Symmetry: C3
């Protein structure tokens, strides 16, 4: 079944997929931000979605931004989350990093996971 | 399908918990008291060992509350065959000292499904 | 079917798993590098791969290097990537970090993923 998503405002851009072999789906900033060196900023996408079962969405770095010193903080979108997906951009570069509305900021990867029951034992 | 067995190596260990039925993984807690200066990192002991599930690894993943305070996760690959005590590398990239108290939630362990292909060298792909 | 790989030069080393229960395949530097503190470097492995289906390769940290302050930037090797696999090593230690040709620098994890359809809705 398809993954449903909602645009909170008209400023949101629907996540995009360019090729059959891409790991993920492009995420875009819904707002203008400026991030000083050595600081981080939560970037709102204005996109909420119903994640697939036995999966989480990993907010993953674009390589081009990573080479510029821009890293991703947090980034775990659980299947229970119905809120605004936020990208924590960390400016580990030396200059101010500017984020404009519509800028590609990360890629969302639907990562397959397991939910085992945990059982405490005396020894393994 | 079958349960993942785990051991509390001391009485200070807290059983990893599911936050909600659709949470990504299992919350880990500090078994000891630490102070992490700004621009430093610390291996935080959980005193938890597990018999990890097959064809997965445990990713030590950040909780966003800590990430927004500048606390990031180093390392974080828990191999399927690892039988030792699980450690969480907390990196204080914030401006102030970060305090970790015994029992504090520090990360979420995600059982990520993986593939072990055979690798074969070729002249051309 | 096995993952086919090519050595771009004879400086490349074949990725291997340490043990039958290891999450990742060892990646090695094909060249010498020097990384200043608070900087990063794209490290060439000189290995290219025909990546497996419904997977991406995550460039993941080795714990020893992580404890020394060396972190991984970027790290998403898409299914469709047929180029030289690069490792972005970030030196978050306090001293200059030396990379010698042949050094183990990271691990590649073949992470299982989904490529779902996306559908915009009014409400989740
Ligand atoms: O980088 C992130 C990390 C998390 N979340 C969402 C998903 C979670 O359900 C919620 C709370 O995150 P935690 O504090 O529980 O990690 O925020 C984001 O939007 N961006
Ligand atoms: O953040 C980490 C990283 C690794 N390990 C443990 C689990 C791994 O299987 C093992 C890897 O050890 P080395 O092979 O790097 O020595 O260490 C942790 O507890 N926490
Ligand atoms: O750490 C990294 C991140 C990416 N890549 C490769 C694989 C990706 O498919 C490609 C990304 O290229 P762009 O689409 O971002 O230009 O680069 C690496 O070799 N190492
Ligand atoms: Cl991951």
């Amino acid at each position: 079944s398809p993954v449903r998503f909602v645009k909170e405002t008209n400023r949101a851009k629907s996540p995009t997929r360019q090729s059959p072999g891409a790991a993920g789906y492009d995420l875009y900033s819904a707002y203008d931000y400026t991030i000083p060196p050595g600081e981080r900023q939560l970037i709102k996408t204005d996109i909420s979605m119903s994640m697939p079962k036995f999966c989480y969405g990993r907010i993953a770095p674009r390589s081009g931004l990573s080479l510029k010193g821009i890293d991703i903080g947090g980034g775990v979108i659980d299947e229970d989350y119905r809120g605004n997906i936020g990208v924590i951009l960390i400016n580990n570069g030396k200059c101010t990093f500017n984020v404009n509305t519509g800028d590609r900021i990360a890629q969302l990867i639907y990562q397959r996971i397991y939910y085992p029951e945990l059982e405490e034992v005396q020894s393994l």
